[PDB]
Amino acid sequence: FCGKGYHLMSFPQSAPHGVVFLHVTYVPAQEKNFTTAPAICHDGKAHFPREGVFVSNGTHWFVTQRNFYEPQIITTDNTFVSGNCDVVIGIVNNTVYDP
Partner 1 sequence: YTMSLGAENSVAYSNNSIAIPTNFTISVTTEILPVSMTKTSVDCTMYICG
Partner 2 sequence: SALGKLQDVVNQNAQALNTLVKQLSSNFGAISSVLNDILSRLDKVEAEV
Partner 3 sequence: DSTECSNLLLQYGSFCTQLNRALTGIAVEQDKNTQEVFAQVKQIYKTPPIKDFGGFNFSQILPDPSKPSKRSFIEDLLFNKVTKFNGLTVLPPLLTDEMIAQYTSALLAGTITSGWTFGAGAALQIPFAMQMAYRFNGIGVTQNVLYENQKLIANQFNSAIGKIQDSLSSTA
Ligand X SMILES: *[C@@H]1O[C@H](CO)[C@@H](O[C@@H]2O[C@H](CO)[C@@H](O)[C@H](O)[C@H]2NC(C)=O)[C@H](O)[C@H]1NC(C)=O
Ligand Y SMILES: *[C@@H]1O[C@H](CO)[C@@H](O)[C@H](O)[C@H]1NC(C)=O
Residues of the shown chain interacting with partner 3 in the complex, contacts defined by CB under 8 A: 4-6, 25-29, 31, 33, 36, 38-39, 46, 48, 53, 66, 82-83, 87-90
Helix (H, G, I), strand (E, B) or coil at 45: strand
Residue nearest to ligand Y (CB): 33
Contacts 24+ apart (CB under 8 A), 30-37: 32/69, 37/61, 37/90, 37/91, 37/92
Cβ nearer to partner 2, comparing 16 with 58: 16
Cβ nearer to partner 3, comparing 36 with 93: 36
Least Å distance between CB 96 and partner 1? 20
Measure the CA–CA gap between 67 and 27, rounded to whole angstroms. 10
